[PDB]
Design a protein around this ligand. Sequence first.
Ligand SMILES: O=C(O)[C@H](O)[C@@H](O)[C@@H](O)C(=O)NO
Ligand SMILES: O=C(O)[C@H](O)[C@@H](O)[C@@H](O)C(=O)NO
Ligand SMILES: [Mg+2]
Ligand SMILES: [Mg+2]
Ligand SMILES: [Mg+2]
Ligand SMILES: [Mg+2]
Lengths: 384, 384
Amino acid sequence: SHMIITDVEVRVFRTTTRRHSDSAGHAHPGPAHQVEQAMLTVRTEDGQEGHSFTAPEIVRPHVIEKFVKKVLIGEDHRDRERLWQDLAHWQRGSAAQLTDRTLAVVDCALWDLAGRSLGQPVYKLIGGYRDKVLAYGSIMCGDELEGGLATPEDYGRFAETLVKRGYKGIKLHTWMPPVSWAPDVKMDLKACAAVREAVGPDIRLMIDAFHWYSRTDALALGRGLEKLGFDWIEEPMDEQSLSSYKWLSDNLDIPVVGPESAAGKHWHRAEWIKAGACDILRTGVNDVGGITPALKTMHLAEAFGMECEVHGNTAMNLHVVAATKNCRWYERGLLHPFLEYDDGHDYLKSLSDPMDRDGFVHVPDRPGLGEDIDFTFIDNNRVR
Amino acid sequence: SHMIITDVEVRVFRTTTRRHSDSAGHAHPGPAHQVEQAMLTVRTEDGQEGHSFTAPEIVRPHVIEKFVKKVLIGEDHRDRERLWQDLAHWQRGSAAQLTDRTLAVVDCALWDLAGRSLGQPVYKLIGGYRDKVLAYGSIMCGDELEGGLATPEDYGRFAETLVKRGYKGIKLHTWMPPVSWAPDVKMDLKACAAVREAVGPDIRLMIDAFHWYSRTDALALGRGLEKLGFDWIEEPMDEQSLSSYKWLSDNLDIPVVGPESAAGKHWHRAEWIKAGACDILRTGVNDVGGITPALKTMHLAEAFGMECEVHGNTAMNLHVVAATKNCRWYERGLLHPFLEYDDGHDYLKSLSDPMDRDGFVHVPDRPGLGEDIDFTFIDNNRVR
Ligand SMILES: O=C(O)[C@H](O)[C@@H](O)[C@@H](O)C(=O)NO
Ligand SMILES: O=C(O)[C@H](O)[C@@H](O)[C@@H](O)C(=O)NO
Ligand SMILES: [Mg+2]
Ligand SMILES: [Mg+2]
Ligand SMILES: [Mg+2]
Ligand SMILES: [Mg+2]
């Protein structure tokens, strides 16, 4: 009975970061400040622990007490499928409070617990495909910061820097509200043209555009991208409209990738395959409710001979990418010329995703998710 | 480097069984006799081992030397996805010698090795869903043995015995060549009616018919089954014809389950979903080339909200069933009134799939695949 879960705990602590998020939820660099971060811990009878990080609201007491503890406490931690399905079945009646984000942090903590318990990296437990993987440099949303990402020329200069760092692929996130003049398709294309000019034809280029363009605007964006040899166009329209994506993919020659933000996990992603709403599937640990369903989405895509690109940085997504074949990249970012991604986080002693000068991220040979957690820092910086 | 594979070994031994296979490959009870059986062993630097069983031809020297050793030796055994994909990529150029059967035994041995190494049952490593599962009694193909499975009445009598044993579901395999008069749709339906009469309306009933009926004969069989409230019809036609199954499913009200024997693993099974060639998907460790791709098939089906029923008995299939939700049964069989399934095999010290009196199979709490191997018996009974 050493494998039985005895405790579920949340520690909220302050992290110092220059990353801010605007009113729409987009990241930007700004003043160094302290932000509240949460760590979820699952503990078993024998004292073994698994941990994962998320925003405090996602693991607030309402959610832990009403849903999470009731599913987990007293259960064999290795029954990840049963526990995941139990939590999933409680979402419908949760008054919209038990979200996929909550499922994700719980599932990740359970995987970390299994890996730490067995002394195994998560991707090795799943069944490894690769120990290193190419990363694309994922550029932060556009801004109005002088020398930052304010002009098309700003994107081109930053792209040169990224190529020097070793990235073999680069993804632009272009301008979005509340940027004063945004969005504008012509501006987005000028940024794309500036980057292509700067890096030449042998660097892979992708764009993740304003996410609420009309069909006609997304069509015009896509056409412009084809002339620049871009590899994909990502989420240029509201993904709640499967039909719009079917239409856009049918019209555009450039591959459309998605859905990133759509609900319904692997079940709804199957519908994207069936409807021909994308050329390349998308998944992500946070987007589909954990490592467990992310793996399902990867397998789903593979059975159709499709790639499925994994949204998001951090260990949880890196381990999905390392355990699977049909994904071209790990997404490393978001990046901005004002910030140094390789500096990491104050609550981690080292990077979860270090990248060599050839543009390969090497999965750390550390058990569980391999997050090198600075528990002392977290204790010294507690809120609640 | 303790996890590096150092050896791949095959031991052929004699097992005493009353099971024979006719020239078409169907099992029947006959004289007790000795049959050659193979055990594949994968060993790592630290001396840890994983084992799996198969027919000797499937792991003969040609296949071990030309393919299996070249992929496995010197590799981290935990890289199951990489090793599986490497073997898969060698099938095309293998002059038809590297079969899904070979991939399956290799993948199974790798899973057993991981589980044994960590002291974990394979389904717990994957991520457990259930520790016990309902089994259906899977009845051997029909025969011409008096009191065996020679008449419709014989099926009904055997079905009564199975309900007493605890089975909540029963699947008939009906008469096939080389049975002298077979096949015959009206006889198949007489057997089905005899079973329904014997067990009443609350036992679930399935049929797996002669596998090469024409469209029109399978249609007639299906219509007949609908009047008897059967749960599914399985492989009544050549599965090489996806179109025939789409037609049959569209015409029949009774659920069609498949494909069992079709090649192409999870990739081809996706096409069965897309074409609507079945109502319930089918997979099996031996049919799709291992535990790894059987899991993929289960996930594929789950994303479409479908069940995927797992073909075959033994530990390897039981662990797939135990790790997943969208499968109603474990297939326990093949069964015949002349044989006692619960007697097991001479080369296993106990059953991999013991069933309680309520018809639940309990997954053994033993590491790896949990096969309780009698290594001493195997050594005393060696051939090569
Ligand atoms: O609009 C945004 O903030 C970005 O699209 C963001 O969600 C980013 O993480 C993304 O979509 N990457 O692929
Ligand atoms: O034809 C046979 O021998 C049976 O159909 C056999 O393949 C059996 O294992 C099966 O199909 N079970 O579902
Ligand atoms: Mg995106
Ligand atoms: Mg297109
Ligand atoms: Mg069958
Ligand atoms: Mg039908």
